[PDB]
């Protein structure tokens, strides 16, 4: 059975933000299929090439790529999934996203995560997830804290609408890998987002995933944008989704 692996860009980005990591996949023979799903502002979906095909990779680009509205960027996500099925029949998918493409996938799963007419999740890769806020926005550096279970010492607006998201992950045996960076510069962050922010995903999933792992890459090559431009991160993701 065929499983499309969708790559979503963070704020400001496009399909070119996803390239370095899928190019690491192709060099690993993973698949010969890559295609681009483009989504306008209205939310009509255009595929550049068609589909047939093992471990196919699909790159998702939103034309309106500066929309901070999680519910419409999670509505878009459901439009691509439901276009990949209506057209190519794909029944399951892996998801990997950068920063805010992941906050849009927590709102996808929240509003469309129990529907069955929709391609089902299998694995999940989360790069610099921005779950309990952003640095220098609605949080500050070393301010917010997480316990054992990734529960925030303080929870921000959006994080709270996502509390009942375990209810969706339960019993779907969804594996989840949580990748974030610690520059090591005394700020416990990826330059842009807090480790507690993305680490607070473990409390959103509440022990209801088939599998939950976190990887804290460290150093200069573990900076926000450096995360999807590292090869030691991209193989981490290859071996998880595909090996």
What is the residue whose two structure tokens read 């390239």?
A: 19
Q: In the chain, which residues are last before a break of more than 2.5 Å from C to the next N?
A: 52
Contact criterion met (CB below 8 Å) for 87 and 79:
no
Extract the tokens encoding 187.
């700020």
Q: How far apart are the C-alpha atoms of 175 and 99, rounded to whole Å? A: 19
Extract the tokens encoding 56.
């196919």
Extract the tokens encoding 40.
């306008």
Contact criterion met (CB below 8 Å) for 215 and 4:
no
Q: How far apart are the C-alpha atoms of 85 and 118, rounded to whole Å? A: 8
Extract the tokens encoding 34.
């890559």
Q: How far apart are the C-alpha atoms of 133 and 193, rounded to whole Å? A: 8
Q: Measured between alpha carbons, how far is residue 176 from residues 115, 141, 202, 203 in Å?
A: 20, 26, 10, 13
> Is residue 102 exposed (0-12), middle (13-18) or buried (19+ Cβ within 10 Å)?
buried
Query: In terms of DSSP H, where are the helices of the chain?
Result: 19-26, 70-88, 100-112, 157-161, 166-169, 195-199, 201-204, 231-241
Contact criterion met (CB below 8 Å) for 141 and 194:
yes
- Provide the pairing of β-strand 3-8 with 57-62: parallel
Ordered structural domains, the chain, with CATH: 1-243 (3.40.50.1820)
Q: How far apart are the C-alpha atoms of 23 and 113, rounded to whole Å? A: 29
* Residues whose CB falls within 8 Å of the CB of residue 220, separated by 6 or more in sequence, listed in order: 183, 226
What is the residue whose two structure tokens read 């519910």?
A: 71
Experimentally determined by: X-ray
What is the residue whose two structure tokens read 């419409």?
A: 72
- Among residues 76, 78, 79, the alpha carbon closest in space to that of 64 is found at 76
Extract the tokens encoding 119.
């391609």
N residues, the chain: 243
Q: Measured between alpha carbons, how far is residue 230 from residues 8, 98, 180 in Å?
A: 17, 13, 12
SS3 111: helix
Extract the tokens encoding 213.
């792992």
* Residues whose CB falls within 8 Å of the CB of residue 179, separated by 6 or more in sequence, listed in order: 125, 126, 127, 128, 214, 215, 217, 227, 233, 236, 237
């Amino acid at each position: 059975k065929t499983t499309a692996t969708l790559f979503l860009h963070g704020y400001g980005g496009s399909e070119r933000s996803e390239t370095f990591m899928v190019k690491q996949a192709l060099n690993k023979n993973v698949t010969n299929e890559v295609i681009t799903a483009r989504v306008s502002s209205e939310g009509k979906v255009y595929f550049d090439k068609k589909l047939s095909a093992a471990n196919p990779i699909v790159k998702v680009e939103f034309k309106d790529n500066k929309n901070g509205n999680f519910k419409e960027n999670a509505y878009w996500i459901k439009e691509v999934l439901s276009q990949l099925k209506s057209q190519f029949g794909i029944q399951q998918f892996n998801f990997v996203g950068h920063s805010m493409g992941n906050m849009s996938f927590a709102f996808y799963m929240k509003n469309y995560g129990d529907d069955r007419h929709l391609p089902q999740l299998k694995k999940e890769v989360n790069i610099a997830g921005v779950y309990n806020g952003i640095l220098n926005m609605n949080e500050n550096v070393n301010e917010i804290i997480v316990d054992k279970q990734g529960k925030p010492s303080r929870m921000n607006a959006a994080y709270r609408q996502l509390l009942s998201l375990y209810k969706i992950y339960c019993g779907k045996e969804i594996e989840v890998l949580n990748i974030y960076g610690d520059l090591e510069d005394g700020s416990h962050s990826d330059g842009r987002v807090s480790n507690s922010s993305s680490q607070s995903l473990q409390y959103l999933l509440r022990g209801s995933t088939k599998s939950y792992q976190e990887m804290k890459f460290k150093g200069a090559k573990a900076q926000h944008s450096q995360l999807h431009e590292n090869k030691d991160v991209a193989n981490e993701i290859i071996q998880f989704l595909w090996e």
